[model samples]
Target: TISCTNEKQCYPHCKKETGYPNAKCMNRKCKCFGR
Candidate 1:
């Protein structure tokens, strides 16, 4: 999980950058799926 204020910050900060696509922002945080 990545702590962020928006999707732009969240998506890039999440595992998505490492090749995962299941990343999202919610409640001011980033959530990564299929971990």
Candidate 2:
């Protein structure tokens, strides 16, 4: 889980960093899932 304020901030970071194709901001965290 990554700290985040919004999907816009989380999405790209997840895609590049986590290498997860799907991402969302939940509970103020960036959740990356679904390869």
Candidate 3:
């Protein structure tokens, strides 16, 4: 599975992976930085 090192690294990766550029983790269950 993919993971982001931090929020900054997460944005673009998340967009490309999920096709949601403006998407942000609503809860703390994001698959990145353990948050």
Candidate 4:
């Protein structure tokens, strides 16, 4: 698990670089998932 400040900050990099296809923002935090 990793945390980011925004969904945009997490989505692009998480999907492209980290191989995570799912991301969402909660409580101003970006939660990224590989599932």
**Which lDDT values do the candidates have, in the order given?**
0.61, 0.74, 0.47, 0.66
Give the number of the best model, judged by TM-score: 2
Model 2 TM-score relative to the real fold: 0.51
Q: For model 2, what is the error of residue 26's alpha carbon versus the real structure, in angstroms, after optimal superposition?
A: 0.9
Ranking by TM-score: 2, 1, 4, 3
lDDT of candidate 3 over 3-26, digit per residue (tens): 444445556655666665553343
Please tell me which model should have the higher TM-score, number 1 or number 3: 1
Residue runs of model 1 more than 4 Å from their true location after superposition: 1-9, 16-18
lDDT of 1 by residue, 11-33 (tens): 55555555565677877777666
Q: What does the lDDT read for residue 22 in candidate 2?
A: 76
lDDT order, best first, reads 2, 4, 1, 3
TM-score preference between candidates 1 and 2, better one: 2
Which residue pairs collide in model 1, if any? none
For candidate 3, give the lDDT of residue 24.
38
Residue 22 displacement (Å), model 3: 5.1
Cα lDDT tens digits, model 4, 1-35, are: 45556667668755875688677766656665875
**Model 4 misses residue 33 by how many Å?**
1.0
Q: Which has the higher TM-score value, candidate number 3 or candidate number 4?
A: 4
Clashes of 1: 0
**Given candidate 2, what's the lDDT at residue 5?**
77
